[PDB]
Paper text:
Methylaminomethyl modification of uridine or 2-thiouridine (mnm5U34 or mnm5s2U34) at the wobble position of tRNAs specific for glutamate, lysine and arginine are observed in Escherichia coli and allow for specific recognition of codons ending in A or G. In the biosynthetic pathway responsible for this post-transcriptional modification, the bifunctional enzyme [name] catalyzes the conversion of its hypermodified substrate carboxymethylaminomethyl uridine (cmnm5U34) to mnm5U34. [name] (formally known as YfcK or TrmC) is a bifunctional enzyme responsible for the final two steps of biosynthetic pathway of mnm5s2U in tRNAGlu and tRNALys, and mnm5U in tRNAArg. The C-terminal domain (MnmC1) catalyzes the flavin adenine dinucleotide (FAD)-dependent oxidation of the Cα-N bond in cmnm5U34. The resulting imine intermediate is (presumably) non-enzymatically hydrolyzed to 5-aminomethyl uridine (nm5U34), followed by S-adenosyl L-methionine (SAM)-dependent methylation to yield mnm5U in the N-terminal domain active site (MnmC2).
Here we present the FAD/SAM-bound crystal structures of full-length [name] from E. coli (ecMnmC) and [name] (ypMnmC), and an FAD-bound crystal structure of ypMnmC. In the FAD- and FAD/SAM-bound ypMnmC structures, of the 689 residues, the first 28 N-terminal residues, 183–184, 451, and 602–609 are not represented by electron density. The ~30 disordered N-terminal residues in the ypMnmC structures are near SAM binding site; however, this conformational flexibility does not appear to affect SAM binding, as the ligand was fully occupied in crystals of ypMnmC which had been soaked in mother liquor containing 5 mM SAM. Our structures show that ecMnmC and ypMnmC bind SAM in an almost identical manner. Although the overall architecture of the binding pocket is highly similar, a few additional residues are found within hydrogen bonding distance from SAM in ypMnmC; e.g., Thr-69, Asn-72, Asp-156, and Asp-178, which interact via their side chains, and Leu-71, Asn-72 and Val-157 via backbone amide group. SAM-bound structures of both ecMnmC and ypMnmC show that Asp-178 is the only charged residue near SAM, except for Glu-101, which anchors the ribosyl moiety through multiple hydrogen bonds with its side chain. The distance between Cϵ of SAM and Oδ of the Asp-178 side chain is 4.1 Å in ecMnmC and 3.6 Å in ypMnmC. In addition, the side chains of Phe-24 and Phe-180 contact the nucleoside segment of SAM, shielding it from bulk solvent in the ecMnmC structure, although Phe-24 is not visible due to disorder in ypMnmC structure. The binding mode of SAM within the MnmC2 domain was examined by soaking pre-existing crystals, which did not elicit any significant structural alteration of the MnmC2 domain or reorganization of the MnmC1/MnmC2 interface. YpMnmC and ecMnmC share 61% overall sequence identity and exhibit similar structural organization with an RMSD of 1.1 Å calculated over 626 Cαs.
Author numbering: 34 to 450, 453 to 601, 611 to 674
The structure:
């Protein structure tokens, strides 16, 4: 059982000995058929011993990538783990984070961020062609497990073996329990030098191999995501939600990061509301957007829960979010969402009466329920994260408004309309003020003002248990303050944040206009004129922008022949300059994954989504779309 898994997969790949001699900060494992996580857990255990033994070794981080067609339920997993008492503490940590069986990639951060696990739910043969370039020449060791080739040969094909080899780092290796000739030959022609060796207790034979030379893969240069060359010296310009997260995700990898915030405090931009909704944006199309939002939402709740379990404090309730079909238009949208077959734990159609049963108040309409969503307080959250970011080594310079940005001799010159500063690597996280630079002003980002009202609760109002979405939204009472949030105005190209009376009334009218069949909405009282204004940064396709800051003039020039050639050059970018923004009204949900993607990209690591989704999040994607045909 345990000793076997060890013999085949860890020993068959050089471990535990390779740990000590590994030349890199992290090591990438890739596994076919996760199952109950035996291989992963056995590997975790060994990497933990190693880290205790040699706290000073090059290898600090571990990245495990795995495919599973039939993801088990967490109970199943707990039942099986009983076979192995000594993996219990690792097993427990993995079960505390098992995700719902939703299709696609689910990144789990384990062992205090020393371990990144990517769970890809789906049939491996179908997923492979869809994957990103950041997987090419990346894998240190394969764990080629699965059903026995004779009992089921459906996965052991040339397409699989080739992709494996394509994703393997030169010098990297694989091992598998099986011995079957066509596998031998299948892996050899894929590009490995294969050795046949005896299995555990000479019961059955098995195979191991090494990739002697890098394979020159199918590649997609136009949407290339390059790494930063130096992560020892980084500045973020921002101070909003996406900065805290971005900072945090870089300090997991040991980057040194510095914060420059225009305001006296963080979260004085758009991340500063009292209560914001958190739920996924579905559309039933299975496009880039849905796929992204499916991972981002679940990831977001995971991270916010981990944070929570570690003492970080912010007002919030995962009370579930109820989205209402109040409209011919909205009802049609909800109807299209509900075409994909979601787990009820993710999203569920429900009737007026069910939603009203849950809500505590008559909801006037049927709709869709998101049981894991809720509200949180973005202000408290951003302050909390900036602080932890600080405590873990991020120097912060508030009242520091960047005024000029210049690259002169390997360094970014920063000027502050106070002491000027220079940095090797810079990230822009400025929200709506993102396209204000020579360097960023060709990006199709827009500013959209919004005002959220603050309203006292009432005995009947206090009853509401869900966040409600219509043409606008109403949160439950915050127990700590006895007030709700109801919003929001949406003013394109308006960037002022002065309180407006017109917009205050509109927030109530939206609620009354959309739920005319019931009477309790009348209890919403905006007459105290308390509200908050802020500016959103919107993108016409609804996905954020995260990556290398692209070079407009250099792109149109470099890619004139593009449409024709479907080996080209990788995309033109401003050196060591990256960004993350364009979160519109869904940043609570999208920030954590965009944050992680940036850190991941800047460390040249493999990324947690497929080629089209990643492509669809790239800063240069809008330019690349015109020139992608003419
Ligand atoms: C009315 C309204 C309602 C919303 N409702 C929701 C909701 O229900 N759910 C949800 O998820 N999200 C909601 N949002 C927020 C949405 O997610 C935002 O897009 C998100 O908060 C973006 O945050 P950010 O960190 O990218 O930028 P911001 O939070 O706006 O931060 C930008 C930062 O950059 C700094 N800065 C800017 N320029 C400079 C300069 N040049 N030099 C130094 N520092 C600079 C500012 O000081 C600020 O700290 C709402 C927003 C608004 C305005
Ligand atoms: C031996 S079991 C899992 C053992 C696993 N190595 C462990 O550590 O527990 C093999 C697994 O392969 C998965 N599998 C089989 N075919 C697959 C495919 N085409 N794509 C993804 N997973 C597959 C099965 O669902 C099954 O969970
Ligand atoms: Cl908000």
């Amino acid at each position: 059982g345990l000793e076997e898994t060890h013999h085949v997969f860890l020993k068959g790949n050089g471990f535990p000995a390779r740990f000590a001699s590994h030349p890199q900060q992290s090591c990438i494992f890739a596994e076919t058929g996760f199952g109950t996580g035996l291989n992963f857990l056995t590997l975790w255990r060994d990497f933990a011993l190693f880290r205790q033994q040699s706290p000073n070794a090059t290898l600090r981080r571990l990245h495990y990538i795995s495919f599973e067609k039939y993801p088990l339920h967490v109970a199943d997993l707990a039942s099986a783990h009983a076979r192995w008492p000594e993996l219990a503490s690792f097993a427990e940590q993995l079960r505390a984070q098992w995700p719902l069986p939703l299709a696609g990639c689910h990144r789990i951060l384990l062992a205090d961020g020393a371990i990144t696990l990517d769970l890809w739910f789906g049939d491996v043969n179908t997923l492979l062609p869809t994957l990103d370039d950041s997987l090419n020449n990346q894998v240190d060791a394969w764990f080629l497990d699965g059903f026995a080739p004779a009992k089921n040969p459906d996965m052991w094909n040339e397409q699989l073996f080739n992709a494996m080899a394509r994703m393997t780092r030169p010098g990297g290796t694989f091992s598998t329990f099986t011995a079957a000739g066509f596998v031998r030959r299948g892996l050899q022609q894929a590009g490995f030098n294969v050795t046949k060796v005896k299995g555990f207790g000479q019961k059955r034979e098995m195979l191991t191999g090494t990739l002697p030379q890098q394979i020159h893969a199918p590649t997609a240069p136009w949407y290339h995501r390059p790494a930063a060359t130096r992560c020892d010296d980084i500045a973020i310009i921002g101070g909003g939600i996406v900065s805290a997260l971005t900072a945090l995700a870089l300090q997991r990898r040991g980057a040194v990061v510095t914060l420059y915030c225009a305001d006296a405090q963080p979260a004085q931009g758009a991340s500063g509301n009292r209560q914001g909704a958190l739920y996924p944006l579905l559309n039933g199309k299975n496009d880039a957007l849905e796929t992204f939002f499916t991972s981002a939402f679940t990831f977001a709740r995971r991270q916010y829960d981990q944070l929570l379990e570690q003492g970080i404090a912010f007002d919030h309730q995962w009370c579930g979010v109820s989205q209402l079909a109040f409209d011919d238009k909205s009802r049609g949208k909800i109807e299209k969402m509900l075409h994909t077959q979601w787990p009820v734990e993710f999203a569920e159609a429900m009737s007026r009466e069910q939603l009203s049963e849950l809500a505590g108040l008559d909801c006037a309409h049927d709709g869709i329920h998101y049981p894991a969503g809720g509200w949180l307080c973005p202000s408290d959250l951003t302050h909390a994260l900036m602080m932890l970011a600080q405590q873990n080594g991020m120097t912060c310079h508030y009242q520091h408004e960047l005024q000029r940005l210049k690259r002169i001799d390997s360094q970014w010159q920063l000027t502050f309309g106070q002491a000027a500063k220079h940095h090797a690597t810079v990230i822009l996280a400025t929200g709506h003020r993102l396209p204000e630079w020579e360097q960023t002003h060709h990006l199709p980002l827009s500013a959209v003002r919004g005002q959220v009202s603050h309203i006292p609760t009432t005995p009947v109002l206090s009853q509401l248990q869900q966040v409600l979405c219509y043409d606008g939204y109403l949160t439950p009472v915050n127990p700590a303050n006895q007030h709700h949030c109801i919003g929001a105005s949406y003013q394109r190209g308006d960037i002022a944040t002065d309180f407006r009376l017109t917009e205050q009334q509109e927030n109530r009218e939206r609620l009354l206009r959309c739920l005319p069949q019931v009477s309790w909405p009348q209890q919403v009282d905006v007459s105290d004129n308390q509200a908050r204004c802020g500016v959103r940064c919107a993108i016409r396709d609804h996905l954020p922008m995260v990556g290398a800051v692209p070079d407009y003039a250099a792109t149109l020039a470099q890619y004139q022949d593009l449409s024709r050639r479907i080996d080209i050059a990788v995309a033109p970018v401003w050196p060591e300059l990256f960004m993350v923004g364009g979160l519109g009204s869904r940043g609570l949900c999208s920030a954590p994954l965009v944050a992680e993607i940036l850190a991941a990209q800047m460390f040249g690591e493999p990324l947690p989504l497929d080629a089209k989704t990643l492509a669809a999040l790239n800063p240069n994607r809008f330019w690349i779309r015109k020139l992608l045909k003419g």
